[PDB]
Ligand binder design. Structure first.
Ligand SMILES: [Zn+2]
Ligand SMILES: [Zn+2]
Ligand SMILES: [Zn+2]
Ligand SMILES: [Zn+2]
Lengths: 55, 55
């Protein structure tokens, strides 16, 4: 429950659109979204939104 | 290992946007988007795209 690759504190629950990388908690994903130039920190693809993943 | 909830034949690979339901193979998710009133079969939310999820 500590597997977010950004903060390593929260649980992974979010994926970025459209690259689909599912490696982030929602707080870190939201922070990615309101950067000046939102982009995936892993693959650098531009980010248009973050979604919570439901499996 | 998870089975697509539509066909129960292929692995789960894709999620719908924006509801984030991650329960579909890419073929079944593509079929969802290509319909004329696209909506998630699980929660009935309108679907604006389907993406492959990378975990
Ligand atoms: Zn985080
Ligand atoms: Zn990415
Ligand atoms: Zn399927
Ligand atoms: Zn849904």
């Amino acid at each position: 429950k500590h597997d977010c690759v950004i903060c390593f504190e929260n649980e992974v629950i979010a994926a970025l659109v459209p690259c689909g990388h599912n490696l982030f908690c929602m707080e870190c994903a939201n922070k990615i979204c309101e950067k000046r130039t939102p982009s995936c920190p892993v693959c650098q693809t531009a980010v248009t939104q973050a979604i919570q993943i439901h499996s």
